[PDB]
Amino acid sequence: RRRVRAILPYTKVPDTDEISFLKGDMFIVHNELEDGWMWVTNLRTDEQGLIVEDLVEEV
Amino acid sequence: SHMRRRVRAILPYTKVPDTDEISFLKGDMFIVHNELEDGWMWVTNLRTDEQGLIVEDLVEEVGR
């Protein structure tokens, strides 16, 4: 249960469970998943969803 | 296509031994990482955090 930060923005793939975000957004990681993905909650939008792991860094 | 979606088990499943299928309980949720051309998919079970193969016939999309 750690916080990670977006280093770049991301626009979700339509009709999927991915979420869009902005550089600087903070997320709480719920599941690491396979390398390359993460199941998280974006603290700014309060949205739970799938994100691309290479766009976030440890804080 | 269930790619990049969260899906939920509609029935339990016990893996075939010596395969990389994963056993799961009804209600378990998963994130789909790869969809193979036979209905099977590489996923992560959100409860156990294990990666493995599950078949699409046993799950339904539930959204975020």
Short mmCIF file of C-alpha atoms in Angstrom, two decimals, chain A residues 10 13 15-19 30-34 37 39 47-50, chain B residues 3-7 31-33 42 44-47 49 51 62-64:
data_model
loop_
_atom_site.label_atom_id
_atom_site.label_comp_id
_atom_site.label_asym_id
_atom_site.label_seq_id
_atom_site.Cartn_x
_atom_site.Cartn_y
_atom_site.Cartn_z
CA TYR A 10 -1.74 9.57 -19.77
CA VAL A 13 -7.65 3.63 -23.85
CA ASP A 15 -13.90 1.57 -23.19
CA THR A 16 -11.39 -0.08 -20.84
CA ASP A 17 -10.88 0.16 -17.11
CA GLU A 18 -7.84 2.37 -17.45
CA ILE A 19 -7.93 5.86 -15.95
CA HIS A 30 -3.79 -1.65 -4.50
CA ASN A 31 -2.22 -4.40 -6.63
CA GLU A 32 1.09 -4.59 -8.45
CA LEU A 33 -0.38 -6.87 -11.17
CA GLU A 34 1.89 -8.07 -13.98
CA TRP A 37 0.42 -2.39 -15.10
CA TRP A 39 -4.41 -1.28 -10.09
CA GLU A 47 -11.00 7.11 -9.31
CA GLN A 48 -9.97 3.48 -9.00
CA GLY A 49 -8.53 2.00 -12.16
CA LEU A 50 -5.77 0.55 -14.27
CA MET B 3 -8.37 -6.52 -22.65
CA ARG B 4 -7.49 -3.97 -19.94
CA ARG B 5 -10.75 -4.71 -18.09
CA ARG B 6 -11.63 -5.96 -14.62
CA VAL B 7 -13.64 -9.18 -14.80
CA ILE B 31 -7.39 -7.66 -14.52
CA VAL B 32 -6.92 -8.96 -18.07
CA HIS B 33 -3.39 -8.46 -19.45
CA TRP B 42 -3.30 -14.00 -18.92
CA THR B 44 -3.88 -11.10 -12.28
CA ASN B 45 -6.28 -12.32 -9.56
CA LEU B 46 -6.81 -9.19 -7.45
CA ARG B 47 -7.41 -11.15 -4.26
CA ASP B 49 -2.11 -11.13 -6.53
CA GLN B 51 -0.72 -14.08 -12.32
CA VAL B 62 -17.77 -5.55 -13.99
CA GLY B 63 -16.06 -2.24 -14.73
CA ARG B 64 -14.03 -0.04 -12.37
#
